[PDB]
């Protein structure tokens, strides 16, 4: 699909690619600092094309082809980005497919738009992101990060291109945490997670499943899966999950 | 009712006329290139005045008293116009009355706002507008329109003041077609159609009725009715339909 | 909580104070010309802090720390202010606590956002405000106010700092009256009212209760309560009402 832009007033314009077709549509919500051109996004687009269903992928504010100053971006702004795509680009019932951060944000979207969002598929769902890990750190480290103004990440995160996080970003993200309360999502949910995920522990998907009020939640745990879940077999699992969900919803 | 304007940010301001009264209110959504001063709109306003119910009529972007450059208007922009009236002017439960294009757009509005829209009445509902006819044309004609950049309409459309349509407008309108999928409208629907309609075939209303998920859909076919459905007897049918629906909803 | 601002496009920015915590959150909607620093608002914030629940208080356009020209403010604009806080600041399920005008506006908010608003608590709910009293006045007085352009209020209103009201404000407020129709609120509602309220008669809360479609409405009438309901015992009643409702909703 070719490049379009959503004009927003007093918020940065968002770049997106849209495929015409049947509803329910699919919206792909990417991972942290990921643009819409990744392996999973493109694979989901090609599957929707073969099924004849509508599809949207897009770039967060500050990322890829979208407008915005990445230095000022926050989880809260990216949450509103998802809502802008859902409200102003998508029409009719939608299945959300969210990777990592995108899985955190798809939950917010389903809470906010319970009529329009008819199912959720998460991949390595990063609910409550790094706020969880920040608050598990010893208090002295928490005060060191605050004084420094940034958290320099453990080396395992460097393998994915993550290195530093501002203190202000962590504190803003606290407003968007969900695991301290029931998650009022009432639609079907499928949560895929690799058990060798070194960024988001697989147990996070079980915590999300437990908090979701919907009784219809499955967690699919892949023994040798890592955080990106983009090997050929992992793409096949994602496509099968989408195909089975569309069938069930029909 | 006297003339008011809805201020929108980075979208053209919309002209509307609003009558105070009881809810459910009625919103009249006009036909293609029709302003809010037509026979049916004024008749519905007078009926709501006699019943004591709230009522809104308005002009699409680019039309009548509204702002906007008509040359840049699209079905997608007019869809958002309807949503702007429903969100920013109307308060409480609404019955939508849509004529021609307005009947296509009322479906979008009910899909998008299922809590607020409590019933639909369509008149010569132009679901999927002229996209249907464009794609039924032979392929060579489709390429001729694309090369020319406009579709010069069959003469029968000239009788209503329709002559030419840009290719770009047709392709944008493809994003808003509904008949390829279930239409997730769950409220009562009444679809009036003249069987001698030379612009939108009466069978279109049966197709819409079949796709609507709501079990409560009636199609009223008037043997000698034409596209505008504005003879005195057709106005009486419309008012009776509104009155009977308000009674049923009470 | 410390002072934040909601940026709105082509509407005045709103000042608010937000407390992080569990959902359901609470939003306090203040009385006419009241800022967010009143006794009840602060008491509800302290209770939410002790319970660990999220909380928002805010200033209407034109009031307190918010932007806006108070001379141009209307009930309709303040209604949209409430919706802006609910949409753009609050996340997840909310209990609305509305005092006086705020109780009128919380009803609008629950009508407009039936998924997000999960309960209502009103204090001296001023449904249909002073429109009711204006239209009970003799016709000659109504024409005198119209010619003068303002209504100089009975002296009993002066005790609360209310003196004059523009005619234009009264007529705009007619658009937001609710008691002429069923009130399509479907959540639990608790309406507190002092029987010695000289500003809003206690019977107004019974009228609201009767019009609300929800079967789950209680009216709590305090024999010696006045309009502000801010004595220590009235604060205790409000906190107990919130605590009992959160328990019931859990
Ligand atoms: Sr812009
Ligand atoms: Sr850039
Ligand atoms: Sr800790
Ligand atoms: Sr299969
Ligand atoms: Sr404007
Ligand atoms: Sr013009
Ligand atoms: Sr064809
Ligand atoms: Sr009758
Ligand atoms: Sr602004
Ligand atoms: Sr000021
Ligand atoms: Sr009277
Ligand atoms: Sr107790």
Phi/psi zone of residue C54: left (φ > 0), alpha (ψ -120 to 50 degrees), beta? Answer: beta
Q: B115 to chain A: which residues are within 8 Å by CB?
A: 115
Locus of tokens 């197709």: B207
User: DSSP label at B61?
Assistant: T
Specify which residues A217 forms β-bridges with.
A189
Which residue out of A80, A182, A186 would a mutagenesis test of the C interface target, given it has the greatest number of C Cβ atoms within 10 Å? A182
Cβ contacts of residue C239 below 8 Å, gap of 6+?
C43, C44, C47
Q: How many CB pairs under 8 A join A and B?
A: 29
Q: Do residues A95 and A53 make contact, with C-beta atoms less than 8 angstroms apart?
A: no
* A9 phi/psi in degrees, rounded to 5: -90, 125
**How many C-beta atoms surround the C-beta of residue C107 within 10 A?**
27
Q: Do residues B240 and B227 make contact, with C-beta atoms less than 8 angstroms apart?
A: no
Specify which residues C190 forms β-bridges with.
C121, C218
Cis check for the bond before A13: say yes or no (omega within 30 of 0): no
Specify which residues B18 forms β-bridges with.
B56
Gaps after residue numbers in chain A (C–N over 2.5 angstroms)? none
Counted domains in chain C: 1
Chains in touch with C (3+ beta-carbon pairs under 8 Å) read A, B
User: DSSP label at A176?
Assistant: G
Cα–Cα distance between C178 and A6 in angstroms, integer? 37
Q: Do residues A9 and B9 make contact, with C-beta atoms less than 8 angstroms apart?
A: yes
Q: C7 to chain A: which residues are within 8 Å by CB?
A: 10
Cα–Cα distance between B133 and B119 in angstroms, integer? 28
Half-sphere exposure in the Cβ direction for C12 (13 Å, CA): 22
With H, G, I as helix, E, B as strand and everything else as coil, classify residue A32.
Answer: coil
With H, G, I as helix, E, B as strand and everything else as coil, classify residue B91.
Answer: coil
Q: Is B197 a catalytic residue?
A: yes
Q: Classify residue B182 by burial, with Cβ atoms within 10 Å: 0-12, 13-18, 19+.
A: middle
Q: Classify residue B35 by burial, with Cβ atoms within 10 Å: 0-12, 13-18, 19+.
A: middle
The closest alpha carbon to C62, from C32, C21, C24, C92, belongs to C32
Locus of tokens 């009719």: A92
- Cα(C122) to ligand 11 centroid in Å equals 27
Q: Which ligand is nearest to the CA of C61?
A: 10
Helices (H), A137-231: 139-148, 155-158, 167-173, 203-211
Q: Answer whether C114 touches A (CB < 8 Å).
A: no
Cβ contacts of residue A114 below 8 Å, gap of 6+?
A184, A185, A186, A187, C115
With H, G, I as helix, E, B as strand and everything else as coil, classify residue C138.
Answer: coil
The closest alpha carbon to B190, from B125, B114, B101, belongs to B125
CA angle C151-C155-C160, nearest 5°?
95
Sign of torsion over alpha carbons C164, C170, C176, C180: positive
Cβ-defined contact of A7 to B10 (cutoff 8 Å): yes
Q: Do residues C39 and C230 make contact, with C-beta atoms less than 8 angstroms apart?
A: yes
Cβ contacts of residue C232 below 8 Å, gap of 6+?
none
User: What are the tokens at B7?
Assistant: 């201020």
Sign of torsion over alpha carbons A8, A14, A17, A19: negative
Q: Do residues C23 and C60 make contact, with C-beta atoms less than 8 angstroms apart?
A: no
Q: Do residues B227 and B100 make contact, with C-beta atoms less than 8 angstroms apart?
A: yes
Q: Do residues C76 and C6 make contact, with C-beta atoms less than 8 angstroms apart?
A: no
The closest alpha carbon to A77, from A39, A56, A57, A105, belongs to A105
Q: How distant is the Cα of A196 from the closest Cα of chain C, in angstroms?
A: 31
Cα–Cα distance between C14 and C85 in angstroms, integer? 8
With H, G, I as helix, E, B as strand and everything else as coil, classify residue A95.
Answer: strand
Interface of C with B in 26-65 (CB under 8 A): none
Half-sphere exposure in the Cβ direction for A240 (13 Å, CA): 8
Q: Do residues A9 and A88 make contact, with C-beta atoms less than 8 angstroms apart?
A: no
Residue B132, CA distances (Å) to B52, B127, B176, B182, B204 in order: 40, 9, 12, 17, 10
Cα–Cα distance between C34 and C52 in angstroms, integer? 26
Half-sphere exposure in the Cβ direction for B247 (13 Å, CA): 6
Half-sphere exposure in the Cβ direction for C19 (13 Å, CA): 25
The closest alpha carbon to A27, from A35, A15, A17, belongs to A17
Between strands B3-6 and A189-194, the pairing is: unpaired
Cβ-defined contact of B20 to C108 (cutoff 8 Å): no
Cα–Cα distance between A162 and A149 in angstroms, integer? 17
Q: Answer whether B22 touches C (CB < 8 Å).
A: yes
The closest alpha carbon to C31, from C120, C162, C165, C119, belongs to C162
Cα–Cα distance between C50 and A99 in angstroms, integer? 36
Cα–Cα distance between A112 and A106 in angstroms, integer? 10
Q: How distant is the Cα of B8 from the closest Cα of chain A, in angstroms?
A: 10
User: What are the tokens at A31?
Assistant: 């991972």
CA distance from start to end of chain C: 26
Cα–Cα distance between C131 and B72 in angstroms, integer? 43
- Domain range holding B111? 1-250
Q: Do residues B91 and C83 make contact, with C-beta atoms less than 8 angstroms apart?
A: no
Residue C162, CA distances (Å) to C130, C154, C155, C158, C159 in order: 12, 9, 9, 5, 7
Helices (H), chain A: 39-51, 75-88, 101-112, 131-136, 139-148, 155-158, 167-173, 203-211, 232-249
**How many C-beta atoms surround the C-beta of residue B240 within 10 A?**
12
Residue B193, CA distances (Å) to A195, B111, B184 in order: 59, 22, 21
* C68 phi/psi in degrees, rounded to 5: 115, 155
Q: A21 to chain B: which residues are within 8 Å by CB?
A: 180
* C220 phi/psi in degrees, rounded to 5: -110, 115
Helices (H), B12-152: 39-51, 75-88, 101-112, 131-136, 139-148
CA angle C201-C207-C210, nearest 5°?
155
* B182 phi/psi in degrees, rounded to 5: -55, 145
The closest alpha carbon to A93, from A142, A135, A53, belongs to A53
Cα–Cα distance between B108 and A129 in angstroms, integer? 36
The closest alpha carbon to C17, from C8, C30, C103, belongs to C30
Interface of B with C in 116-145 (CB under 8 A): 116
For the packed helices A101-112 and A75-88, what is the interaxial angle rounded to 10 degrees?
60
With H, G, I as helix, E, B as strand and everything else as coil, classify residue A109.
Answer: helix
Locus of tokens 């509800």: C44
Q: How distant is the Cα of C91 from the closest Cα of chain A, in angstroms?
A: 8
Cα–Cα distance between B25 and B172 in angstroms, integer? 31
Cα–Cα distance between A212 and A225 in angstroms, integer? 24
Cβ-defined contact of C23 to A182 (cutoff 8 Å): yes
3-state secondary structure string across C22-57: EEEEEEEECCCCCCCCCHHHHHHHHHHHHHCEEEEE
Half-sphere exposure in the Cβ direction for C238 (13 Å, CA): 31
User: What are the tokens at B139?
Assistant: 């392929």
Q: Do residues A69 and A93 make contact, with C-beta atoms less than 8 angstroms apart?
A: no
Q: How distant is the Cα of A180 from the closest Cα of chain C, in angstroms?
A: 6
User: DSSP label at B70?
Assistant: G
**How many C-beta atoms surround the C-beta of residue A72 within 10 A?**
12
Cα–Cα distance between B124 and B198 in angstroms, integer? 10
Q: A10 to chain C: which residues are within 8 Å by CB?
A: 7-9
**Which one of A80, A175, A178 has the shortest CB-CB distance to C20?**
A175
User: DSSP label at C3?
Assistant: E
Q: Is C100 a catalytic residue?
A: yes
With H, G, I as helix, E, B as strand and everything else as coil, classify residue C224.
Answer: coil
Report how this structure was experimentally obtained.
Answer: X-ray
Q: Do residues B125 and B104 make contact, with C-beta atoms less than 8 angstroms apart?
A: yes
Q: What share of chain B is helix, strand, coil (3-state, %, to 5)?
A: 40, 25, 40
The closest alpha carbon to B236, from B250, B247, B220, belongs to B220
Cβ contacts of residue B72 below 8 Å, gap of 6+?
B62
The closest alpha carbon to B211, from A22, A20, A95, belongs to A22
* B137 phi/psi in degrees, rounded to 5: -65, 155
**How many C-beta atoms surround the C-beta of residue A234 within 10 A?**
21
Specify which residues B112 forms β-bridges with.
none
Q: Do residues C23 and C54 make contact, with C-beta atoms less than 8 angstroms apart?
A: yes
């Amino acid at each position: 699909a070719s490049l379009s832009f959503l004009n927003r007033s007093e918020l940065p314009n968002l770049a997106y690619k849209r495929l015409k077709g049947k509803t329910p549509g699919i919206i792909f919500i990417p991972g942290y600092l990921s643009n819409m051109n990744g392996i999973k996004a493109v694979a989901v687009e090609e599957f929707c094309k073969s099924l004849g269903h509508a599809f949207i992928r897009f770039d967060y504010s500050g990322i890829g082809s979208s407008d915005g100053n990445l230095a000022e971006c926050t989880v809260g702004k990216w949450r509103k980005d998802v809502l802008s795509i859902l409200d102003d680009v998508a029409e009719g019932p939608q299945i959300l497919v969210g990777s990592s951060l995108g899985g955190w944000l798809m939950l917010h979207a389903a809470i906010a738009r319970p009529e329009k969002v008819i199912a959720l598929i998460g991949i390595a769902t990063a609910a409550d992101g790094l706020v969880t890990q920040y608050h598990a750190l010893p208090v002295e480290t928490q005060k060191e990060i605050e004084m420094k103004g940034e958290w320099t990440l453990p080396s395992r995160y460097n393998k994915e291109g993550y290195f530093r996080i501002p203190y202000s970003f962590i504190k803003e993200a606290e407003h968007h945490c969900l695991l301290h309360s029931p998650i009022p999502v009432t639609c079907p949910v499928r949560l895929l997670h690799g058990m060798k995920d070194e960024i988001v522990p697989w147990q996070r998907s079980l915590q999300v499943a437990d908090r979701i009020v919907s009784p219809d939640v499955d967690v699919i745990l892949r023994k040798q899966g890592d955080h990106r879940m983009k090997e050929k077999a992992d793409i096949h699992l994602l496509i099968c999950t989408i195909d089975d969900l569309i069938d069930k919803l029909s």
